Write a protein that binds this ligand. Structure first.
Ligand SMILES: C[C@@H](Oc1ccc(F)c(C(N)=O)c1F)c1nc(-c2ccc(C(F)(F)F)cc2)c(Br)o1
Ligand SMILES: Nc1nc2c(ncn2[C@@H]2O[C@H](COP(=O)(O)OP(=O)(O)O)[C@@H](O)[C@H]2O)c(=O)[nH]1
Ligand SMILES: [Ca+2]
Length: 306
């Protein structure tokens, strides 16, 4: 078994995220670009492009109307089905609060779910500076997404205002939000490709992520003294995500280190994650020894079930 991964951008923000992943290059991942706006879609370098709702919008965007996004996706349901064929895991990325993403992303997610793919949404909420209407439309989108996916990761754009200085370019801030999806997809790619000393596979991912709701995901990297505790604390901190680890009922956790990775430090790291989660957490723990590493360790966590 080698899980087929597809990453689907829906609407402007979603396609912005996909374009940055295409720019980096991600081997053994299929990228799909979905939009109402034909002009925007023509500029995408995704190898699979679906212009949705041409009869409805005449090739324009949805004008921030989620009903138009929804009806566009429904018009083009068969083309979406065709593009998703063969997927074992689908990431649907979209900015909530507009028209295309808000309306179409839940339709796309439900199609993926009903084809049997493990369906993960990674979505943003609008900045408060965009106003109450955008925020209310986005909230309805988030709820529709939660109903349609297996697991949802939500990034409030306001959290970007906590990690910038007064001069940080807008595009640099956007790259930070993008990195959540990109590093997530990279983690799954590594999990499916590499054989761990304590091995985790795609069935473990499904146990933790299938038919859940909101999730915390994070990665922590440290070296030197107290590296295990530091990396584990960083992994569970995830300042861009609205979901916290507190009370998590399911956890998939991996530790990657060099030959020096000690049993004592593995316990330290796992205890940090455990102490935060629910008393009866279903925790699946993995370990990889990468001999090319020296003093670095990397802790990766996804936490579900709240
Ligand atoms: C770092 C990677 O895990 C591994 C990589 C490489 C491996 F060899 C092994 C292993 N122990 O077999 C392993 F668990 C990983 N990826 C993830 C992960 C990544 C992304 C998500 C998602 F889908 F975005 F939410 C969920 C989980 C986790 Br927890 O751990
Ligand atoms: N973080 C981030 N948020 C974005 C980006 N583009 C758009 N957004 C957010 O996504 C929301 C919807 O915009 P957009 O996706 O362009 O609308 P749609 O094409 O109608 O789905 C906006 O209100 C913003 O909050 C982006 O590149 N990065
Ligand atoms: Ca593995």
């Amino acid at each position: 078994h080698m899980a087929t991964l597809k990453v689907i951008g829906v609407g402007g923000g979603g396609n912005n995220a996909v374009n940055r992943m295409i720019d980096h290059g991600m081997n053994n991942v299929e990228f799909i670009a979905i939009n109402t706006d034909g002009q925007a879609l023509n500029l995408s370098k995704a190898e699979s492009k679906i212009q949705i709702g041409e009869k409805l919008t005449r090739g324009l965007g949805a004008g921030a109307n989620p009903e138009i996004g929804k009806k566009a996706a429904e018009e083009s349901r068969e083309q979406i089905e065709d593009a998703i064929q063969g997927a074992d895991m689908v990431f649907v990325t979209s900015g909530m609060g507009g028209g295309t993403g808000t309306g179409a992303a839940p339709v796309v997610a439900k199609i993926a779910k009903e084809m049997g793919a493990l369906t993960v949404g990674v979505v943003t909420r609008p900045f408060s500076f965009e106003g109450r209407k955008r925020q209310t439309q986005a909230a309805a989108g988030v709820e529709a997404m939660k109903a349609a996916v297996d697991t949802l990761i939500v990034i409030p754009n306001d959290r970007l205002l906590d990690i910038v200085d007064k001069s940080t370019p807008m595009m640099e801030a956007f790259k930070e939000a993008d990195n959540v999806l990109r590093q997530g997809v990279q983690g799954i790619s590594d999990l499916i490709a590499v054989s761990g000393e304590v091995n985790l596979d795609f069935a473990d991912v499904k146990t933790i992520m299938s038919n859940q709701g909101s999730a915390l995901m994070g990665i922590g990297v440290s070296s030197g003294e107290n590296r295990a505790v530091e990396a584990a604390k960083k992994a569970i901190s995830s300042p861009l995500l609205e979901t916290s680890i507190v009370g998590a009922q399911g956890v998939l956790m991996n530790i990657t280190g060099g030959e020096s990775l000690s049993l004592f430090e593995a316990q330290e790291a796992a205890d940090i994650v455990q102490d935060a989660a629910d008393e009866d957490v279903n925790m699946i723990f993995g370990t990889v020894i990468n001999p090319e590493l020296q003093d670095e360790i990397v802790v990766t966590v996804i936490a579900t079930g709240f």
